[PDB]
From TrEMBL:
Disulfide bonds join 632-643. Multifunctional enzyme acting as 1,4-alpha-D-glucan:1,4-alpha-D-glucan 4-alpha-D-glycosyltransferase and amylo-1,6-glucosidase in glycogen degradation. One of its GO terms (cellular component) is cytoplasm. Its EC number is 2.4.1.25, 3.2.1.33. The lineage of its organism: Eukaryota, Fungi, Dikarya, Ascomycota, Saccharomycotina. Residues 1036-1514 form the Glycogen debranching enzyme C-terminal domain. GO terms for biological process: glycogen biosynthetic process; glycogen catabolic process. It comes from Candida glabrata (strain ATCC 2001 / BCRC 20586 / JCM 3761 / NBRC 0622 / NRRL Y-65 / CBS 138) (Yeast). This is Glycogen debranching enzyme.
Amino acid sequence: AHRTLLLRLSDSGEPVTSCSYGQGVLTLPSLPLPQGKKLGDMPVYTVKLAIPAGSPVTRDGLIWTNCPPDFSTQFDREKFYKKIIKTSFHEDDHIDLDIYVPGTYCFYLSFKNDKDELETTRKFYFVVLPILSVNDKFIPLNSIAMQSVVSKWMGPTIKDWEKVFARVASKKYNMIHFTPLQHRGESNSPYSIYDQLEFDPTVFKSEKEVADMVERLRTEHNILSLTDIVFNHTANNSQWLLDHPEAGYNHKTSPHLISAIELDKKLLDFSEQMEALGYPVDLKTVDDLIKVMDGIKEHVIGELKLWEFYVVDVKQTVSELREKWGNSKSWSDDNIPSKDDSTNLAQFVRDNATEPGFGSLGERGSNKINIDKFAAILKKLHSEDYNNGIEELATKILNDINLPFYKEYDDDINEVLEQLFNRIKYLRIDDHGPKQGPITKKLPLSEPYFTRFKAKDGEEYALANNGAIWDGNPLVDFASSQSKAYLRREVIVWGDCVKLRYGKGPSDSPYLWERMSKYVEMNARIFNGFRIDNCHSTPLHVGQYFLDVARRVNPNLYVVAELFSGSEAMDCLFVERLGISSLIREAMQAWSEEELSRLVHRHGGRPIGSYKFVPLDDFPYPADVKIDEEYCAYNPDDHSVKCVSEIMIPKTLTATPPHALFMDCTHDNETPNQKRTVEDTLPNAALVAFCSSAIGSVYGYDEVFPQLLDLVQEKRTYSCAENTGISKVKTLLNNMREEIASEAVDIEDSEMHVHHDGQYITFHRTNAKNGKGWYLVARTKFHSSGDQMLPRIKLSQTKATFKAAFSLERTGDAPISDEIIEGIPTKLRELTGFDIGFDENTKETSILLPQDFPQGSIVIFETQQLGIDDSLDHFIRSGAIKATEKLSLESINYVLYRAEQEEYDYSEGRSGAYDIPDYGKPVYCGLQGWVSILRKIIFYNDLAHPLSNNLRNGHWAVDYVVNRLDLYKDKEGVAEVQEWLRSRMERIKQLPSYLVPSFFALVVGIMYGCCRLRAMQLMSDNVGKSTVFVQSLAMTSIQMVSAMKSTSILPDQNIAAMAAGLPHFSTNYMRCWGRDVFISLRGLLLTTGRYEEAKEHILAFAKTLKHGLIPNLLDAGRNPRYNARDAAWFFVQAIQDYVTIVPGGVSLLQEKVTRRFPLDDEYIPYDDPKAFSYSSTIEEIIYEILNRHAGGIKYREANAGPNLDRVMKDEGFNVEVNVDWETGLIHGGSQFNCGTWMDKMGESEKANSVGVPGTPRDGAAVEINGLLKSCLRFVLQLSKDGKFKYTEVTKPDGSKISLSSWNDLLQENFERCFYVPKNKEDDNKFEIDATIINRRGIYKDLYRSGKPYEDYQFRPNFTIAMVVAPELFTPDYAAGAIELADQVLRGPVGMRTLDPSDYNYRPYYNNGEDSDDFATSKGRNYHQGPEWVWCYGYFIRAYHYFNFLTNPKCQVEGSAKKLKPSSYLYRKLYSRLLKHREWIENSPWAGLAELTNKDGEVCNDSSPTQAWSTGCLLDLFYDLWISYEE
Ligand SMILES: OC[C@H]1O[C@H](O[C@H]2[C@H](O)[C@@H](O)[C@@H](O[C@H]3[C@H](O)[C@@H](O)[C@@H](O[C@H]4[C@H](O)[C@@H](O)[C@@H](O[C@H]5[C@H](O)[C@@H](O)[C@@H](O)O[C@@H]5CO)O[C@@H]4CO)O[C@@H]3CO)O[C@@H]2CO)[C@H](O)[C@@H](O)[C@@H]1O
Ligand SMILES: OC[C@H]1O[C@H](O[C@H]2[C@H](O)[C@@H](O)[C@@H](O[C@H]3[C@H](O)[C@@H](O)[C@@H](O)O[C@@H]3CO)O[C@@H]2CO)[C@H](O)[C@@H](O)[C@@H]1O
Ligand SMILES: OC[C@H]1O[C@H](O[C@H]2[C@H](O)[C@@H](O)[C@@H](O)O[C@@H]2CO)[C@H](O)[C@@H](O)[C@@H]1O
């Protein structure tokens, strides 16, 4: 059915962590195959790799993976297969990895670097767990019960073993771990294997004899089997070691140990003559040890030649100097240090005259000097005659060379004898280890460091035996050359075993690899898995190769390993590459009760009430996605991995901590009788069994054996004594876990609470799906530490039920047999008296323990949380799609967004945003305000967050989500969305308090995702199929477009009205701004597909035309403000954008609006019946604007006075606009004016700037004239097409100018008036006064401005003209001008409003400055430095266009030999948007800010989400889409 996981990648190709589970591994969940399907019928899993669109990896990117393409192809570690990444600047690419067999798989990505070179990422691994079934019933991995049994103690016959099998089958174990069933070595230790290729001749004779026994265990007792596999060593007496001695490290293969060999055999030879030469051979005196130690120092250390292994043979070099004194002589280097600089000169000879392998160990005299290169230096330094003091000089240098070697030797020898005498004392003088037997050949003074034999090749050899350094790093091969442990005697050896020298591969030890391969696949044919002792000491490449050979034989190979590497990260890396399925954890390692509770806490599960993962505002919502319309397209027999909700965003693949196999007692740790007591066997095994993981135990733990069995010496047999000790309880524990294994699946599905009080440990196991749980009270018996009484146990919203209770008591000591291992007689008394009180009001269960509850007892309760059934998850994960069926792009605004001021508008100031105690209010009143806070809470499982606390303290926030929508109930689809929230929140309130936060976030997140998907479906295809970033920008369109009560766009009605920004531009007269609306109209409405809403705004403002101008401040169409020389031309540009994009958009031209205010610019007539009066068409409105500007205007502001602008000066109200017909440019404004977008008016009385505009842009503005040229080009081609008529324009006098002539006037005179030529020679060609110019290569920001220094100021406004009227610019001039803006005026997120190299540059906006600075106080800086985000949109839109015309590297051909941008240009475009993608990702408001201080510094006064900040970035994506993506 659906076994697909989503693995989103970052921009560098690294997997993305969906949740913080800790240091882990990309493990895929263990699940059975579909009903009646084998390996190969279908892929076991499919990993969907998601690559971000436009990321640097997509540039000629390829996905590599060693996953075979089909089931027929075998797995190869190093054969990777190609997968093509489909590059796009809008759409992310998904590449499936079909997996057919469990194993270790990895993937890496290759791409084209920014250096045009090839680059590769890391290898990223992910494990598919094996499928474990017994007959035809699936065994979940966390329900495995493993019984470890030692072969040589189960009996001499196979039937003697099958009696043990029946005992562990009654205890209901489902897996048996075997110590290696091979022929054992001399010492008969199970791990020193004599021959790897044949089993124990005492019991078996062939593979079929042991294969039938394991298959018998499967069919008879329903038990799987696995063995230990020994890679690190073999027995010291293998008949194949005589044939192939190179399989270990010897004097040939590892020459560095030659020094250690001659020391081991010396020590043993001294042991033979210990009392002969000296006498102390077996005493308990520390002085007696000192005598033999001094004997060692004089009988071995002194007889070992002062160790020439380090030091250079001084006199033997001088002897050889005279010999070749006269051959390759003379040097030339003048750097040769002076003879006075002894140390410096000493090491100079070391670097130049040495034979290969200097300083390192080898043979006796392996470190020597190159003579012809040494004597050549002496001739150059001293004299060419030898007897001239060379013997003194040469010896002096060599003696100083050996100074570090001698100190290296003293430090080595000291750690030899310290290690020796310390070990000698312990091994002899019983401190904690006795057996101080008079030394013998079997018990020599020194433990055997090397195994000696005479090989079949004739020569003698000395293979050592591995072991372990005390506290050394196990990742270091102590037998390799990097370690000096065998020399310094820092090795605790195992004489039973012998080295196994693997190299870099089969080339270094051919027979060893071939033999171990056939040895591995032999056990792989029989058993279900392997167990690896000291896996951390086996090299990675060694473990990787043989485990893959096994999985080729047994595809469902279950791997266990005792893995204690340096850290958790190294543990995860070993699990990643080796494919380990479970890690061994030992419960006996806990020294105290607190250490045991912390161990059980690690492997118990997640906290109770843990948050559940949901796709939120960080996911793409493709409009063309499959959906579970009612979460019903799941069949249990399919065994499919479920999606999170009705939306089919597949289950995310995230790193989870590697699985654990919790052993209450292994075959190497001491018995509870030894470390603690025998009574602790019951509570210790119960706490382990309650963990949500695999569990196991050694044989004898349940049968309370007295002490740990010596794996080397002991020969006694397991007792046939049935049903002893805990065998009855383990039958209960394993049978209980079988009932739980049927439904518990993933890591979020099993939760836990653990408490430790004194000697008691509390374990509360909980299933998060149904509410079923277990409660365990276990009194531990580490020591008999007196009576302790546990306080009252209290469970909230839960009912308890007594299951079972037991006590373990000791009835004397264990029998002392010599032929059979028998345990300690123990009584297992069932307990009673547990009072379970239930308060039928508070629904609180109280549990009191009985006073007869001795140490070593347990009690199990069955529990069930109230309000949770099996049908709760389906009710929450369904119905939300059907509830959003009637939602519209306007109505989604009330469900998701609404600022508190926008909510006060509908609630008359009563409601607002929910106040979270000790935190604050969410940014939006809708779900977006919750999702912005919950995403980090769900990611970290922060149950201590103030919102998490408030959600379980009461149902206030739960009812707040549903009660808000009463304000917007009558709107499209909101009522049905409220009813879904009402029905789901009501069911949630019936749950326990501690479970409310996790379920509250799940309900909000599900409805949020359904609302965001509904938005992408209602929008166009370019948006509804793009990356998260584009969709996040498109959701801003919903934030701004909403119906209000205190304002609108029509004076008669109350309809949708695009706000300028939230929250400071949303209510009353501050919401709609004509300039702001029509800059964002193309981005927020046309790019998204809101065609009818874009028409309503064009028609609404068309009613308020006056002076031939469009008003900036729109008071819903009643008394608007006409101080906007900018708005009319952004408005006429939005009409062109509408007609160009909307199909049949020419129909807008003949739409008749009822023009309020008379044509003759009369007076404010809101009541006067001459308001409605006459109608005007849009075609007429356009011509009215063009002709009125041409014919000249003249007006003082209507209702002029402070009443409007309480700071504007009297002359400031009479603004005007006139067209210089010599040039064609439209001039207008004054030094008391703000008629452009930089409209900051002074309000400082201290700095005396009241009335003084910060940025008056009087004269010819670039944007106005650029939009004028765009409008003229629009109406010319329109009259040609017949949709426009008017072709004549008037004059202030009364003449007439053709529209084409006005169009040509700008074409002939625009660039002349504005471009500042780089050539100082062409200032006589572009109307420039060189006295006032900051930089050249700049299109002037103004023409004929009042203060002419503002004419030549570098401001970002010229980009508007470059985008809307590119014909006004010669390509080479514009390309260089916009490259300067990129280097100078471009900030990280916003565009700098003024060149930093100006004296007026003040880039920090503080609208509360009450200082004396004329330019900074009260926010006069507004447009003199601060970085605005919308100007970045117009900038990069033209930066893309003119780089496509100029730089040829930004061009590429292909389809239809049509020029599409190169990946080099897409790379430059993608880079300039990372800060914008970061901003909208990590902002509580789900948009882009209005303003930013210098260099990305957050401006507090800036509105955090602005309409035209995100709309202009949507303009860029539509340019690249509508022109290339066809
Ligand atoms: O009856 C309705 C209305 O009538 C009159 O309206 C006039 C205003 O009182 C008058 O000030 C003026 O409005 C100007 C404004 O003066 C001018 O500076 C500019 O607006 C700027 C601010 O200058 C600027 O600092 C910034 O202010 C933001 C701030 O950055 C933001 O962080 C947050 O604090 O919100 C502040 C705004 O509230 O940005 C704004 C916008 O760019 O332009 C305005 C419009 O021209 O002229 C109005 C003419 O009607 C009455 O005076 C008024 O009381 C009445 O309510
Ligand atoms: O309608 C929901 C309501 O939620 C918020 O108010 C609640 C607090 O979040 C909640 O912790 C609790 O506060 C108590 C405090 O003693 C104190 O706040 C007092 O004024 O009210 C409670 C008295 O026990 O309960 C309140 C609601 O009573 C949020 O702030 C409200 O705006 C919101 O309406
Ligand atoms: O040489 C160019 C000149 O540019 C700037 O001078 C500005 C000045 O800051 C304005 O206040 C006004 O005087 O217009 C001038 C136009 O260049 C630099 O400040 C100045 O150092 C530089 O020399």
